[PDB]
Amino acid sequence: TLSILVAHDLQRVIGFENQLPWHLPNDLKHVKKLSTGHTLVMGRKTFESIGKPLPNRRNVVLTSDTSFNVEGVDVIHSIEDIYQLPGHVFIFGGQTLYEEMIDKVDDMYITVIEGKFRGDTFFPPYTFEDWEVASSVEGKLDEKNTIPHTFLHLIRK
Ligand SMILES: NC(=O)c1ccc[n+]([C@@H]2O[C@H](COP(=O)([O-])OP(=O)(O)OC[C@H]3O[C@@H](n4cnc5c(N)ncnc54)[C@H](OP(=O)(O)O)[C@@H]3O)[C@@H](O)[C@H]2O)c1
Numbered sequence: 793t794l795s796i797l798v799a800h801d802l803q804r805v806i807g808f809e810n811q812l813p814w815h816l817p818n819d820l821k822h823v824k825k826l827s828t829g830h831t832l833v834m835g836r837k838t839f840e841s842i843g844k845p846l847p848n849r850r851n852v853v854l855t856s857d858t859s860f861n862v863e864g865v866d867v868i869h870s871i872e873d874i875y876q877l878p879g880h881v882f883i884f885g886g887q888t889l890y891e892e893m894i895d896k897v898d899d900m901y902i903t904v905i906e907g908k909f910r911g912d913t914f915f916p917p918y919t920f921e922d923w924e925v926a927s928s929v930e931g932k933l934d935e936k937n938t939i940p941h942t943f944l945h946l947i948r949k
Pocket residue numbers: 797798799800805806807808809810811812834835836837838839841854855856857869870871884885886887888889892913
């Protein structure tokens with residue numbers, strides 16, 4: 793199983809200066825829950841953003857750099873290597889990966905952040921004409937989680 797994992801705002805911003813533009817613990821708990829015991833694929837920039845392997849799952853980092861050999865982390869140098877990986881594979885970011893994989897994944901788990909932020913990286917445009925809403929569940933707003941947000945599970949029609 794090949795899935796995208798992404799959080800994006802109303803204009804499909806995903807990134808600003810190699811960080812997330814928003815602070816939203818719920819989303820991060822969601823990511824954790826979904827991908828425990830499974831595999832994350834991710835481009836070098838996103839990994840260096842996170843700065844160390846994510847515990848309790850297989851971290852795979854896609855890079856052109858053949859000197860890459862980080863403890864905790866498996867490296868690949870081709871998009872095609874993704875299809876070799878066993879198990880549930882989540883495409884974890886960032887923009888380059890999403891663009892490369894979006895026509896290939898079986899489904900997407902998306903957090904829509906119901907705000908407009910300044911970004912420098914984006915999720916590719918997509919149509920619900922192409923993608924069916926298997927579930928839509930509103931994040932809960934609270935002291936700690938203060939932007940409206942919706943958990944979409946979409947599956948390719
Ligand atoms: N909202 C979210 O859910 C979310 C999730 C993840 C990331 N982000 C954001 O996304 C932004 C980063 O996106 P980005 O596109 O700039 O970076 P990125 O996708 O994380 O990484 C790009 C790098 O990945 C490697 N790569 C990609 N495709 C490759 C290929 N086909 N073959 C070999 N290597 C390949 C290359 O590394 P090398 O140059 O080393 O070869 C490339 O420079 C950040 O702002 C981050 O905060 C948001």
